[PDB]
Design an enzyme around this catalytic site. Structure first.
Site, PDB file in Angstrom:
ATOM      1  CG  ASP A   6      -7.443   6.598  -8.485  1.00 21.51           C
ATOM      2  OD1 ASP A   6      -7.790   5.455  -8.843  1.00 21.51           O
ATOM      3  OD2 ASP A   6      -7.823   7.112  -7.415  1.00 21.51           O
ATOM      4  CD  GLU A  53       4.231  -7.136   9.451  1.00 24.34           C
ATOM      5  OE1 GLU A  53       5.410  -7.155   9.854  1.00 24.34           O
ATOM      6  OE2 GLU A  53       3.338  -6.426   9.953  1.00 24.34           O
ATOM      7  NE  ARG A  68     -15.855  -2.945  -0.952  1.00 29.54           N
ATOM      8  CZ  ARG A  68     -16.753  -2.579  -1.859  1.00 29.54           C
ATOM      9  NH1 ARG A  68     -17.453  -3.495  -2.513  1.00 29.54           N
ATOM     10  NH2 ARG A  68     -16.924  -1.297  -2.139  1.00 29.54           N
ATOM     11  CE1 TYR A 104       0.654  -9.232  10.529  1.00 27.51           C
ATOM     12  CE2 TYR A 104      -0.741 -10.462  12.056  1.00 27.51           C
ATOM     13  CZ  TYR A 104      -0.318  -9.257  11.522  1.00 27.51           C
ATOM     14  OH  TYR A 104      -0.881  -8.083  11.977  1.00 27.51           O
ATOM     15  CB  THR A 155     -10.486  -0.269  -6.610  1.00 32.15           C
ATOM     16  OG1 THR A 155     -11.384  -0.018  -7.687  1.00 32.15           O
ATOM     17  CG2 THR A 155     -10.263   1.008  -5.831  1.00 32.15           C
ATOM     18  CE  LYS A 185     -14.279   2.713  -7.583  1.00 31.69           C
ATOM     19  NZ  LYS A 185     -13.325   2.141  -6.624  1.00 31.69           N
TER      20      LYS A 185
END
Ligand code: FFO
Ligand code: FFO
Lengths: 417, 416
Positions: free
Chosen positions: A200, A57, A235, A55, A226, A229
């Site tokens: 984008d 953050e 992903r 974890y 992303t 692609k």
């Protein structure tokens, strides 16, 4: 004491069989879905690492949990490579996906209800570019813009819309447009009304990386993409920017966390970091060249066969085939080509008389087959078989014939050897 | 594309950092309540070729072709999820806990609606109304905390509910050690016609084993992550029972195309295998040890003169208020870290410091329990911790304790 030898095969056969079948499907099918690709085993290796346990953050150096010394190195690697590959001075590698990266940009620069100028979905814009069934369309006031009767964006009309509606932000980008967007021209338009130019580039990130498509980073206030692609990575989402101020980058970091996400996926970020390194290889540059090149070769054949290709052609990795004049729904075409082991995806076209689930067209992309070894010759031949199926969409003997042809070429061009 | 490609010989930097994390996980005592150690089976899934498939929509109604096998995968995760928790509805696509929660908000409320959620310093999560989170920015939040006793006062909650008439009441927490009366919250919700939304991310594992009250049969909608006590991959999950077709329709739309794009089929495969492992009998006794170990550490902390919020624990975690010791959570966290004991600074009720500094630390037993520790080891660990806190400036004390942890760590390897 979990054993490294604990595997899925001997523990859960149900899940295992399905997985193995997908493994074979990816080998026996010609994937022509523009947004898909085949990530390297290096990216998969990362995603299957123990980094999934941590974890973390916050950001490297400023975390909310202890023991982030090594995940901090990992995240920094992804950030630095991302900046160098695209020429940005700011990069955020934590967004879980393209939608999440976009959501961050919205909430960091706009207030619920602000006006946004984005590309209409049927005309090639993405869901997160103002679709009424998406958060973009529900939280903000959207003014759409599409394409000419020529198949291209009319920057003259865009400017008019901008001057008349005074949008707070203008979105450049697309999911189904085959042309080249003039980033500098959109920035001009934004500047005249003091709006933000948000680009984008998810679909063309790979081509931009190789220098095969105009890079938007130096013209937009903020860019998203992303990593799965044309970039051919895992992903995930990514935020990039150049020439912005400390404030703008602080807002962007806050929008991602604690703004819209919790803990990031350190194992996926490790994968992003290795993929961004592979995108730096010379072979990667010639790879994208083949992609665009193959896309053009398939377009020729489609036109010679009497099929309507939106925009009349392609300047990137994809193109749309309007099937309205053939009295076929994208859903029908998609299903017919599928039985021949040729996977595409139904896609809405401009002024599509059908709804998004049915559509009057199909979208085609060359990233997958190109990464698989295909070149102009193979691509022209594939395009041909496709038209054969469309031509005789009800002839099972035709589909049968083609199916065997693809299985044959799929075997000579293994995906993962 | 050759299967033999690997990171080690291609990206030594990334590989070196990865390998170090691999060792850190072995040489450190992880006491972060939200962490755990997922099985190699879940990692295997996450590293599969399923990462290549785009599958927007749901099994049977996708927006791409070639989703025959990923459809099987997602269905497995959905069915197991429903059976393990007793729900008749389950959504396995949320990318995380935040995303699962975001879906519930946008599916049941309108921007600006009133929501009753647990305050962050009192144990509530960021997505439960924090002003620096989308929850606090898009909705009107009324907070609720805990007694001077350390527990929720359902009497005051009811008053707040009747006075503010919130459209939804949120039950759940990130740092509360008590037991929440789900049925009682549902009563309160019903009296004002509000929705009872319960986020059980932290206790999903315990609920699965039956060690903590299951909220599924009392809430209109439930969310949870799959990576905490459930010990699975990092992801979100939505569950519901007794709802209508309309409500489930909205929930499916909220996730997609509402707030997400394509799901992570490789992570969902992992969710599916982890939900199967949560069905093992050994998994039930595992959670029992977790709660049990948590209690053992609390005893020691109290016997050593440390203030434990709520006076105890009925789950996997507990908070240690360090205000009376003139220490910041940031200091404690850093000190314990040098002794190879990893925790996390945590805000406490009425915390005089900001979230990044805090006046306390949060402790969880899921990791060490899954690692083999039992009451004996846990009591001893809690002891070493107090030794460090007691002499937070004594480097000799910290060093001795680091030797002790490395030692007990070698006797309980995480992955073998
Ligand atoms: N232009 C374009 N093409 C694209 C995308 C996109 O965002 N834009 N997608 C990017 O991923 C995929 C398509 N995704 C879509 C997902 C949902 C809806 C949609 O509007 N659904 C509505 C109505 C559906 C119906 O016809 O019944 C809904 O669910 O309410 C449309 C496209 C692929 N092709
Ligand atoms: N009660 C509780 N404990 C928890 C969580 C939670 O949501 N609630 N977290 C769940 O993951 C982690 C803590 N995450 C947090 C992340 C950001 C902020 C925050 O409020 N940041 C503000 C101000 C920070 C500062 O002090 O400078 C900000 O960034 O603007 C607080 C907690 C662990 N402990």
């Amino acid at each position: 004491m979990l054993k490294r030898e604990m595997n899925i095969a001997d523990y859960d056969a149900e899940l295992w069989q399905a997985m193995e079948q997908e493994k074979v499907r990816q080998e026996e099918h010609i994937e022509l879905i523009a947004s898909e690709n085949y990530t390297s085993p290096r990216v998969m290796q990362a995603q299957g690492s123990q980094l999934t346990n941590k974890y973390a953050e916050g950001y490297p150096g400023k975390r909310y949990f202890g023991g982030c010394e090594y995940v901090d190195i990992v995240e920094q690697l992804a950030i630095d490579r991302a900046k160098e590959l695209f020429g940005a001075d700011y990069a955020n590698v934590q967004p879980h996906s393209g939608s999440q990266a976009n959501f961050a940009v919205y909430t960091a620069l706009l207030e619920p209800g602000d006006t946004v100028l984005g590309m209409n979905l049927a005309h090639g814009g993405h869901l997160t570019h103002g679709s009424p069934v998406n958060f973009s369309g529900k939280l903000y006031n959207i003014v759409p813009y599409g394409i000419d009767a020529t198949g291209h964006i009319d920057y003259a009309d865009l400017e008019k819309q901008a001057k008349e509606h005074k949008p707070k932000m203008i979105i450049g980008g697309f999911s189904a447009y085959s042309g080249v967007v003039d980033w500098a021209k959109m920035r001009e338009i934004a500047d005249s009304i003091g709006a933000y130019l948000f680009v984008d580039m998810a679909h063309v990130a790979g081509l931009v990386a190789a220098g095969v498509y105009p890079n938007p980073v130096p013209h937009a206030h903020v860019v998203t993409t992303t990593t799965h692609k044309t970039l051919a990575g895992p992903r995930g989402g990514l935020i990039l920017a150049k020439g912005g101020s400390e404030e703008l980058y602080k807002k962007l970091n806050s929008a991602v966390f604690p703004g819209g996400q919790g803990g990031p996926l350190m194992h996926v970020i490790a994968g992003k970091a290795v993929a961004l390194k592979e995108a730096m290889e010379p072979e990667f540059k010639t790879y994208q060249q083949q992609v665009a090149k193959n896309a053009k070769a398939m377009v020729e054949v489609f036109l010679e066969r009497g099929y309507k290709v939106v925009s009349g052609g392609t300047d990137n990795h994809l193109f749309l085939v309007d099937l309205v004049d053939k009295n076929l729904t994208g859903k029908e075409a998609d299903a017919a080509l599928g039985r021949a082991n040729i996977t595409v995806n139904k896609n809405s076209v401009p002024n599509d008389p059908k709804s998004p689930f049915v559509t009057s067209g199909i979208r085609v992309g060359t990233p997958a087959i190109t990464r698989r070894g295909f070149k102009e010759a193979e691509a022209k031949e594939l395009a041909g078989w496709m038209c054969d199926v469309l031509d005789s969409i009800n002839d099972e003997a035709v589909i049968e014939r083609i199916k065997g042809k693809v299985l044959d070429i799929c075997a000579r061009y293994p995906v993962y050897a």
